[PDB]
RNA sequence: GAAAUUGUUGAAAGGGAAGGGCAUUUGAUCAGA
RNA sequence: CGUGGAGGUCAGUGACGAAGCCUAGACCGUAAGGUCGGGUCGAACGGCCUCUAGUGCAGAUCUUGGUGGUAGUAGCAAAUAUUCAAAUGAGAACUUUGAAGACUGAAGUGGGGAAAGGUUCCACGUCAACAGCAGUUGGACGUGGGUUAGUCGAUCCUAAGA
RNA sequence: GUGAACAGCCUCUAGUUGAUAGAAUAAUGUAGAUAAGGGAAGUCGGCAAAAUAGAUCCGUAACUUCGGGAUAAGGAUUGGCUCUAAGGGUCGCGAUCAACUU
RNA sequence: GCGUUGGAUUGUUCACCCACUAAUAGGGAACGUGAGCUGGGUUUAGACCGUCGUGAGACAGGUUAGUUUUACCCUACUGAU
RNA sequence: UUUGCUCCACACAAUAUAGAUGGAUACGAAUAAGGCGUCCUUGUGGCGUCGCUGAACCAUAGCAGGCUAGCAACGGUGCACUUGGCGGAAAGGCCUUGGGUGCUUGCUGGCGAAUUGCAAUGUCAUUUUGCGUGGGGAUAAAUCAUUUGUAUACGACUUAGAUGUACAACGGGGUAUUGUAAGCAGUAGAGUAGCCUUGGUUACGAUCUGCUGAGAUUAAGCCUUUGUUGUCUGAUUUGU
């Protein structure tokens, strides 16, 4: 008989299976549609989630109860040092989909990216790309032949880039290598851009700008095996329930005489690939710019790094992307920031945000001070120093 | 790594015992001290002086000190079997406080 | 010193049972003349 | 067709190997079955004519015994709690000694008894089985030792009752 | 020792340190806890839990078989320290001795 | 395609009313769903009442109390090698 | 690697065969329309012709195809070289230059075949593997163990580790939590008890005050580090 009281199902069947992602770096499964009139540019970027903080800004939203008023907003900081271009892949269209025709690599690959090709780097003889780099012996005839093939074919061009983890506080030391689609016309010009940028760095400001809507693609934080109550949000069973209450009472009707795929079951929670869209960039800050965390309203000469450092991450010393709100993945995780797949004109996008103040109080507690100078000014002289 | 040598260390038993069950804290301290001596001397055969066991258990099963100053001496042994011809002996140092002390080579005994 | 059941060795087959019937291929094995 | 036993017969087979058993080896019979070879084995047994029956199994939640898959699985999680060193030993988380940390907390995890048990007491030797891990230890195993009354009990008295 | 207490908690004498262990710290459990705001809307039903709780002082209704109801209900106080006062024995007002309770 | 509720009374399905709501549609799945729960009801044994029966006892009448066992196998499902 | 691996050529051994036995012989579109040829005024053009199936086209004779002698013509075809071009949908094929070599049944001769006994597939293809002989080529990793916690029930994941912006253990600094440590001192302290230079002293005293936002703790899943000390070649396995 019927359910006797209607209620929406628990969870989204489109995010199935709730299994562990096959990689710690979530795949970009779609790049922006290519507009072959614009200049050649990366469609995405690689960064590392540093942490969260809060900003204050005046809201520019006519008709709102908070128009021209100050609002406090959570922001996520993504450490984004320049990525190194080390390769270029050509993709030909086939009746079976896109197929990589060939890949041309840079002549010199740094140990950062060479470590990606090894499970035991320290005891290896580090032979990776040693025979390939000889293809640049005298004139690079083989390299130019492969690039000519990419131009003659390969309706889609993607560059191979890798992060510079040595510039992050992470202990990993093994770089993240990814394909980023080159948008901007003239497949020939895409290949020329890739070849010229071989062994060269691309900074995050050449890809993203202030107020832009971007998408964050990352593997969520892992939580291991989870019961249905927190994995799917099902109702806790009553206290009187024998055999436990963090369960789904009826996992199926008599017929079909099978548990169905749509029934909440205990299993892995977290560590899933997610692609969350429409996160507005609030800052495109630069590592070389001391007073990274300053605004035109604050002027306090401070970097984005909170007092004591980003908890479990470290200090931001590179270029960084501050997006509004939160993004999937935990701190220290590699994230991919990609340009929006559509042209959003909604007055939520297209809003020009100007930060008034960025919180740099310690996130290791109820941080009361923005700067060590401010802590000294409030507390006066202490016994050890100050 | 294959010679006789004595050094004084400080072990952060606080961070090694963080969150440990109360009935297992002192036994866990014993095992962490064995692991500590194994890490620092390379010896699987680690022996603890009964005075060191007293120092560990001084405040019962849960009241292990945050820091202990240990004298670890890697020495050689010759017995029925080779069985790791080197072994470590761990003794307490009996200092007033075990704070602000660096690893030092004893150089005398 | 049987069978159930089991180890080893050897032979063979094995996409959600296995086993069976008719027929032949292939491998192994063998009587009759 | 086959089985146990019986009368007759083949002056049947057999320690130079009877019977039994094993044998994707051979032959006969539509079949019940029969025959042969090879291995194993060790003391009896068979063909035919008849006699006779406690004479043929897939079952009966059959009977007795044996054995699986389950499965190296469920589990060995109440009674706060163990640790260091030495000795012994082939072997030590578990034995002994020392050290330390704990508990029972005198309505005891202490010291005795009644019922019951019956040697479990104690020593020496000792670990195949038992102590649902272990074991060099034990209420185990083997061998011994040990219970001393005029006064403590029984014994005597009567009780309900017999 | 605390305390009204053979309660609970800690200790002395005595005894024991015996419960298979080691390593991790997923879900679901068993046992023990906590929780913003709401406060039984949950549920057959306040089941479970929470709240109350000792002692001193105040105050205590209906009803009643006049005995109770009654710890009704409902209030207040409680540590530590330094003091003050009162409460006894024996000997010949004095001398001396002594323990707690308020 | 999408949603179709919070409550008072009743074990209740049903019913009824309060109220919110865009709406408070109807149904199935062994009258879905007890090795998922719960056990208020029904539905053993205790007990009370009314009627009936000479009686033992009866009542699709009322009332009160009344043990809800097992997954470690196979598949299915969820995750994992 | 107790001579390992790979490629090519040859030979020899195996191994099988979803099934060779002359050739899978390439426009596109329409079908109430087309193909081909040709012409021009180049089109949705005129004229001619074809279909009515591949019943075609090509190939096809020679001891399973031998050995030879000529003629004719500079064709056809095989091979290994070679010139250049095109082909990415799974290209791995298509076309083209030049010379060399063999065959040529286009035509005409000479020799051979037997006895496989009147048939017996009467063995002629290609699939993988191994080995040996030569030539050519290259000179790693992965796993276990240790380690990290962005992971995690176990597996799995993600990190690090052979001399360095290396890693670790400590120590230092930052951050953070609590809330002012111990010790010493005080002409602080309700008072009580003594003492005598009766205007002060001694003893006890919760507490108060100062040194003292001090002291303690702080990564165990915080940040950082010109410091101290140490570590850095164990095991197993993998070949086209
Ligand atoms: Mg419905
Ligand atoms: Mg949520
Ligand atoms: Mg229950
Ligand atoms: Mg924080
Ligand atoms: Mg914890
Ligand atoms: Mg026998
Ligand atoms: Mg058998
Ligand atoms: Mg008989
Ligand atoms: Mg015989
Ligand atoms: Mg057989
Ligand atoms: Mg005999
Ligand atoms: Mg019978
Ligand atoms: Mg039978
Ligand atoms: Mg039958
Ligand atoms: Mg049976
Ligand atoms: Mg049986
Ligand atoms: Mg188990
Ligand atoms: Mg249990
Ligand atoms: Mg226990
Ligand atoms: Mg002992
Ligand atoms: Mg107790
Ligand atoms: Mg106690
Ligand atoms: Mg004894
Ligand atoms: Mg045992
Ligand atoms: Mg044993
Ligand atoms: Mg012995
Ligand atoms: Mg005995
Ligand atoms: Mg007497
Ligand atoms: Mg008292
Ligand atoms: Mg609450
Ligand atoms: Mg509250
Ligand atoms: Mg209230
Ligand atoms: Mg209610
Ligand atoms: Mg309700
Ligand atoms: Mg109700
Ligand atoms: Mg209750
Ligand atoms: Mg009261
Ligand atoms: Mg009352
Ligand atoms: Mg039903
Ligand atoms: Mg069911
Ligand atoms: Mg049930
Ligand atoms: Mg039911
Ligand atoms: Mg009931
Ligand atoms: Mg009844
Ligand atoms: Mg009557």
PDB file of C-alpha atoms (C1' of nucleotides) and ligand atoms in Angstrom, chain D residues 17-20 40-42, ligand 9:
ATOM      1  C1'   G D  17      48.092 -66.910  -3.109  1.00  0.00           C
ATOM      2  C1'   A D  18      41.308 -68.266  -1.194  1.00  0.00           C
ATOM      3  C1'   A D  19      38.142 -64.312   0.260  1.00  0.00           C
ATOM      4  C1'   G D  20      37.836 -59.136   0.458  1.00  0.00           C
ATOM      5  C1'   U D  40      46.516 -54.718  -2.760  1.00  0.00           C
ATOM      6  C1'   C D  41      46.152 -58.954   0.395  1.00  0.00           C
ATOM      7  C1'   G D  42      46.597 -63.179   3.364  1.00  0.00           C
TER       8        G D  42
HETATM    9 MG1  LIG H   9      43.432 -62.799  -4.592  1.00  0.00          MG
END
